[PDB]
Write an enzyme that holds these catalytic residues in place. Structure first.
Site, PDB file in Angstrom:
ATOM      1  N   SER A  27      42.770  17.567 -13.044  1.00  0.00           N
ATOM      2  CA  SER A  27      43.203  16.571 -14.021  1.00  0.00           C
ATOM      3  C   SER A  27      43.435  15.190 -13.418  1.00  0.00           C
ATOM      4  CB  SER A  27      44.468  17.045 -14.726  1.00  0.00           C
ATOM      5  OG  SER A  27      44.210  18.216 -15.475  1.00  0.00           O
ATOM      6  N   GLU A  28      44.113  15.101 -12.295  1.00  0.00           N
ATOM      7  CA  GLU A  28      44.389  13.766 -11.728  1.00  0.00           C
ATOM      8  C   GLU A  28      43.089  13.131 -11.277  1.00  0.00           C
ATOM      9  OE1 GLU A  28      47.060  12.474 -12.524  1.00  0.00           O
ATOM     10  OE2 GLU A  28      48.822  13.686 -12.034  1.00  0.00           O
ATOM     11  N   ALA A  29      42.198  13.913 -10.648  1.00  0.00           N
ATOM     12  CA  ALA A  29      40.890  13.420 -10.227  1.00  0.00           C
ATOM     13  C   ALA A  29      40.051  12.968 -11.437  1.00  0.00           C
ATOM     14  CB  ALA A  29      40.183  14.474  -9.399  1.00  0.00           C
TER      15      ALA A  29
END
Length: 261
Positions: free
Chosen positions: A174-176
């Site tokens: 998700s952060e990527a």
């Protein structure tokens, strides 16, 4: 809802890049964008969820369930003794939990509950993982591969094992997807473990503020500068969209018009 598969066991940089592209293209609103950066939809657009199947080198899998409008992980499933074993965070509503049951495990006669008895905040995950900061939890492809194998199909595992997996997966998925900068940290370190630097952490913690600032920017100028961290832990005062756009993968949903451009 769609399933995006990423083969961690056989990963390469280009396969990861394709995975990131596929996840961003699935999750983004079909039209919304600001300054050329795709935006996630409102909380009503369907499908409301995306599934991400992660496959280890032994062909075992874990499927994460992501909320489309903010990419938060809601829970995960694994195949355990022939059953669809669903693991739901304790911080979602009763109606969302029903959707997680049915989306991860559509066959109601072949599923089994194994709750995540804590919330999904980084402070909580860090506590369960025994770290004072997730800078202390290395990321990496081999780590993700290993961590899948500690859980998938495994009768019992500790909260620390689970929280480490969640910290690594949430960030590498998700952060990527939210931040090209984080995708690029993974790619720069693709063959090895690495520790998330101050800029990784700062971006993760400020995605809402950054997305709002980009949406509201007029002629490329932020209305109010936004103070973040560089990778060397110095302050980064962002004045213009072009200073931060390269690091962005997706904008958080923000209502109203913006320069699309």
């Amino acid at each position: 809802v769609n399933t995006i598969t990423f083969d961690v066991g056989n990963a390469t940089i280009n396969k990861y890049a394709t995975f990131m592209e596929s996840l961003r293209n699935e999750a983004k609103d079909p039209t919304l964008k600001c300054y050329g950066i795709p935006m996630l939809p409102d909380s009503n657009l369907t499908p409301k969820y995306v599934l991400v199947k992660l496959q280890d080198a032994s062909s075992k899998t874990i499927t994460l369930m992501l909320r489309r409008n903010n990419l938060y992980v809601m829970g995960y499933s694994d195949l355990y003794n022939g059953k669809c074993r669903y693991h739901i965070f304790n911080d979602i509503s009763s109606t969302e939990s029903t959707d997680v049951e049915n989306t991860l495990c559509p066959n109601s006669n072949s599923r089994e509950k194994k709750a995540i008895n804590y919330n999904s905040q980084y402070s909580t995950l860090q506590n369960k993982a025994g770290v004072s900061s997730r800078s202390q939890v290395q990321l990496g492809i081999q780590i993700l591969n290993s961590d899948i194998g500690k859980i998938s199909g495994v009768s019992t595992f500790t909260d620390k094992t689970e929280a480490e997996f969640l910290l690594v997966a949430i960030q590498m998925v998700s952060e990527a997807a939210r931040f090209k900068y984080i995708e690029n940290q993974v790619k720069t370190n693709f063959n090895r473990a690495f520790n998330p630097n101050p800029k990784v952490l700062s971006l993760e913690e400020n995605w809402g503020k950054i997305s709002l600032a980009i949406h509201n920017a007029k002629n490329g100028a932020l209305t109010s500068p936004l103070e973040l961290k560089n990778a060397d832990d110095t302050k980064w005062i962002v004045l213009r969209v072009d200073e931060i756009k390269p690091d962005m993968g997706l904008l958080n949903y923000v209502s109203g018009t913006c320069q699309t451009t």
